[PDB]
Paper text:
Similar studies have examined the efficiency and substrate specificity of LacAB for the production of rare sugars such as D-psicose and D-ribulose from D-allose and D-ribose, respectively. The structures of the LacAB complex with D-allose and D-ribose revealed that the substrates are converted to D-psicose and D-ribulose, respectively, which bind in the same orientation as Tag6P in the active site pocket. The electron density maps of D-psicose and D-ribulose were unambiguously observed. However, these substitutions were revealed higher B-factors for ligand after refinement. The interactions between LacAB and the bound sugars are shown schematically in Figure 5C and F. The O1, O3, and O4 hydroxyl groups as well as the O2 carbonyl group of the substrates interact with the same LacAB residues as seen in the LacAB-Tag6P complex. In the LacAB-psicose complex, the O6 hydroxyl group is 2.7 Å from the guanidinium group of Arg-134 (LacA). Two rare sugar substrates, D-psicose and D-ribulose, show optimal binding in the LacAB-substrate complex.
Author numbering:
A (entry chain D), B (entry chain B), C (entry chain B), D (entry chain D): 1 to 172
E (entry chain C), F (entry chain A), G (entry chain A), H (entry chain C): 1 to 142
Amino acid sequence: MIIAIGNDHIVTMQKIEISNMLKDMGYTVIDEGTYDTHRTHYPIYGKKVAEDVADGRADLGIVMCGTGIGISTAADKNEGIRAAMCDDVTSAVYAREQLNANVLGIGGAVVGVHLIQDIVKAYLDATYKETPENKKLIDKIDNIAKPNPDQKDNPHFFDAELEKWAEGVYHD
Amino acid sequence: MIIAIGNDHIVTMQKIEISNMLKDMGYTVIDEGTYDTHRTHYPIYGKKVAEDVADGRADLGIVMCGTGIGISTAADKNEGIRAAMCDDVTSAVYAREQLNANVLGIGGAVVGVHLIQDIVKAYLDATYKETPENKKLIDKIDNIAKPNPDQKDNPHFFDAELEKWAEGVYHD
Amino acid sequence: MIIAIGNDHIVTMQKIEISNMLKDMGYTVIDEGTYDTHRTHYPIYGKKVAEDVADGRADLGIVMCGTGIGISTAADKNEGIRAAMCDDVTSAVYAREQLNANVLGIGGAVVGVHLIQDIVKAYLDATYKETPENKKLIDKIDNIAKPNPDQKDNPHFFDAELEKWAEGVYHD
Amino acid sequence: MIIAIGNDHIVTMQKIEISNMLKDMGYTVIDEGTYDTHRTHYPIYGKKVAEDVADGRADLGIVMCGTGIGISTAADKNEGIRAAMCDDVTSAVYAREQLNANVLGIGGAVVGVHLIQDIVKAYLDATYKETPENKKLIDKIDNIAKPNPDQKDNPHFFDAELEKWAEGVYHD
Amino acid sequence: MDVIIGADKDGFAMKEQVKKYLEEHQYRVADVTPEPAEDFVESSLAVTKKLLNSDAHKAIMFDRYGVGSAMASNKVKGMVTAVVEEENTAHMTAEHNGAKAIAIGTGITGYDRALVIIQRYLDTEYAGGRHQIRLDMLEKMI
Amino acid sequence: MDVIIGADKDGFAMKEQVKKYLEEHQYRVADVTPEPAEDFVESSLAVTKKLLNSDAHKAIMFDRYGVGSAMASNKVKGMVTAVVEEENTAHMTAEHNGAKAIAIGTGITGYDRALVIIQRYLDTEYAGGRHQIRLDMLEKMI
Amino acid sequence: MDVIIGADKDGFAMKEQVKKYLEEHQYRVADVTPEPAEDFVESSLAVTKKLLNSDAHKAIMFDRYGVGSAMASNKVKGMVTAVVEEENTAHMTAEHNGAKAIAIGTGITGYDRALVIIQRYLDTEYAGGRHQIRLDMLEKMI
Amino acid sequence: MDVIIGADKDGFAMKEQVKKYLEEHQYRVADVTPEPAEDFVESSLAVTKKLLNSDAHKAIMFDRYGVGSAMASNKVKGMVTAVVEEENTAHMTAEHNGAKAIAIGTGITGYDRALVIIQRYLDTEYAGGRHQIRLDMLEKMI
Ligand SMILES: O=C(CO)[C@H](O)[C@H](O)[C@H](O)CO
Ligand SMILES: O=C(CO)[C@H](O)[C@H](O)[C@H](O)CO
Ligand SMILES: O=C(CO)[C@H](O)[C@H](O)[C@H](O)CO
Ligand SMILES: O=C(CO)[C@H](O)[C@H](O)[C@H](O)CO
């Protein structure tokens, strides 16, 4: 199985720990998230992981940032994706078993590494158990957003924002 | 104010982060926990921190280990101590406000650094507020254990176990 | 300017520090080396960085492993590359000024981060200065190896070895 | 054998690595250097390690800071001490064998951990080999400074400077 | 300050408790699910609609696990919903993210903790600045 | 497998639910608080006494925050109680520590999560070995 | 043990000293540059040819910076040359890498240190095992 | 700028080379060991004396291993001598420490590297500020 993983600069170290674990477990990993700890933007990596999963390059995805909210929200906002923001094992298992979530989000700065490992393992070990009940829920979820061809598989999608960033438009 | 802190080898890095923060906040820190990451035993440091607090060398104490359970329990098993095991802000504030807990325990491997910082800050910022109800609970807790002069202020209390360890008695 | 960087699992943390620095300095970084600390093989990343430089995708390259010997040697064994193994500032400047070295190798486990930063800075700040003497040395070096089209731009070049590894052929 | 170790805040992580190694090697360690990474002053820890060695609480000492110059110089400026600043195995062995140096200084930010480990091991493994030649050198060295009873075993020796620091006298 | 709230059958109980809490603390509450919603998709979308179509910038969604309401509402262009189970994210998601709403799972988070989470969320304003680039990116997505 | 359970007024409701859960899963349950205890000190100590006297090696204490039941029961010589609010400690405290009991705070932990925590705790055996030194140290303390 | 040595004009002096050292310690030395080579490319390649053809598995190249002899000789298929300026790489490159030769820069490394580096290199055997995959990869390259 | 230099028998050769280098680069050099000193204790103390008793703030001590000259001269109250073997300390010791002198071991450091080290040291001024507390502490010691 192939797992795509991504992250922002705040949790690169936690991402490395999970990447190592996944490989020890026999999983093939596609690391998309940022590779160092230089200030960057979570949506970039959330989108990359989402597309790997949606296009079939990866079976499932895992994304992390400080709280996980930002990057998991970015991953959710893509066609074919059901991203589950889970800082606990219980909801992560529910996400996989009932909502067939294909992207797991975790807060690398609020959850300790041992617990992150447990959440990831539980999420991966879980299996979607279809029922007419959850199939209806899932279908409703898959039909909420309106597909935008300009976003789908478009690497230059955020260039506009990146340029403004280089121009100091987003100063503090 | 003086804060005593301790830890086992699993969470020395998290201890360092909290130590740094406490000093930046103006607290005087007495680091007792282990200083490196060489395999050691949580009760040793839990006891050291507990006595700093009980003997008046420190106002409050903070102890951490992988889950916090071991070291916070060790700390609790000392005269004059009310140790609270809190991996969340809500129970930590309750511990200080209602139980006048003087030792805070946290799981450095299950709680992320940002949340650890929040728990510590909330615990320290909180103030004990006496009430006929919690005064009665506190009195009960302070009288459960039977004092052992052989343990009180005895740093050699665990020597027998340390010797058995050096002799391979506790092999896996 | 574009800098390609790579590393094996022993020095991923040092690579991250250098990546951060290069970006703060205004360079565009292409991180090829391994992204986590899971056991892997230095020739893979040395080759990737070497080709980025040889194919014009990057202006210069920097590769690191425990001692730097393995990855810098891997990088050197590619068309168009002159890789210099330098754990000091003096030889690094010489490498750039006299040999027009386009790939810098450093031992991330034997050189401290501050000195690594100095070596990288000195190497980058240096400028090649042609002379009838070094032009002749450079020409000799560029003509020692016999080009192998099967290796050039072939990312599957080491697949046979990777398979033997997955099959336990390289056990200790 | 007992080894006293100390460090400033810049190299606490490297100190931890060495402390771990020393313990795995069977040495008893007295960690004096700073325990976290909060800004502090190298002379404090250099002096503490020096006195452990001079008073017989430790057999040898190891001190580190960014370059090692500061803390090793502080260690040298104490009665009964011969501190050797060595970022290499060769001079460290010479220091022990010829000058019977009892305190080793290393730059934790300029020397990689693998090399630091090698320097420490070589220094510890070496044995002083007395000759009328080096005995004369050593005696001359031991008689250069004039003993100051106000410094010897005086923990409040630097209080004056620390107060000024708290008062913002040493601002940048 | 205004707060939009909603819940499905699983989060209805806590939703009612929080409403009483909020009203007791001078908060003007807009309950879009006086009766429990069919499911978390309906409740979260109802809260989102009322939010994006109002002058309120704080909302709380209640369901069993939190994940569902966030997964659903985040599909709406411009919406940003944070599942919250601890006290750090409670304030950080508001400070850094648009945090238009937080989702609480009643099967995951106890009531006392929920109140601390809610109070922290309500008491925190968006910092803007550098964070806006990420919010601009999110709003650009479907 | 035997399991001792107890609770004060704040933890009674969940205690009752868990008791039903345990019975449904063939566990032999010893409830020391058929009626809610006066406070968590009474309930936690009642659980501790029953446990240290029984052949059971698993117990669950319920109160509002968990913290209290653990703080009080750990004062008993030989007792080891773990406050648990997440799924990693749920099993690690059993594996590494004596974990003679776990304490759950009903105002902190939701029911569904509590059940996962409880099952992980019950399914995990103490590993012994190197961990015994720490337990010997703890049992030596007051 | 056999050792192949060579040097250009800048590394000749040290090469001569080391040769004396090696002979004094019973090493069978093959000096490919009795007279200094025209440049480090000539000397490093001379050493490489003699080594890959001899039964010796240890060699030392001398030049002003080390960098050049390594850069040039590593272009030879199957060759592995390590520039060495400190005592850890001195043995680690032999243990992990093929380290068919080490390159010392006379303008970088002092004589006493060079001798320690050389002796550590000569006293260390290749560990094989997992390391062989990387060597197989290197020998495959041009 | 002025530079005080000195050396024992082992560092004399490089000392003479550096003196010519320095004089060629407009540096005013004060050589306190026109003839090699008896040993590094004599040469380092001679350099220290001339330094502390002059208006120069830069000095270079030459011997075989560097360690000796630093170990000896640092015993003098107020003196600060840094053994230097690499290019980072070369400038950092001047910036952060009083760096009244650097010690170079001719058996450890090659000449070309020595010149880079020396130039970096000479070109760097003390930063003062927060660093002064440490220098005040050192000068207070014997
Ligand atoms: O948690 C995050 C987004 O939800 C990020 O880690 C932080 O916003 C961080 O400051 C990067 O933007
Ligand atoms: O969490 C812990 C004790 O409760 C410790 O960190 C672990 O048991 C660790 O393995 C050291 O004993
Ligand atoms: O230095 C290295 C190769 O020269 C590598 O870092 C080590 O061999 C490491 O063990 C990985 O192979
Ligand atoms: O190398 C050091 C002193 O020689 C210290 O690490 C640095 O001066 C650091 O800035 C602390 O003062």
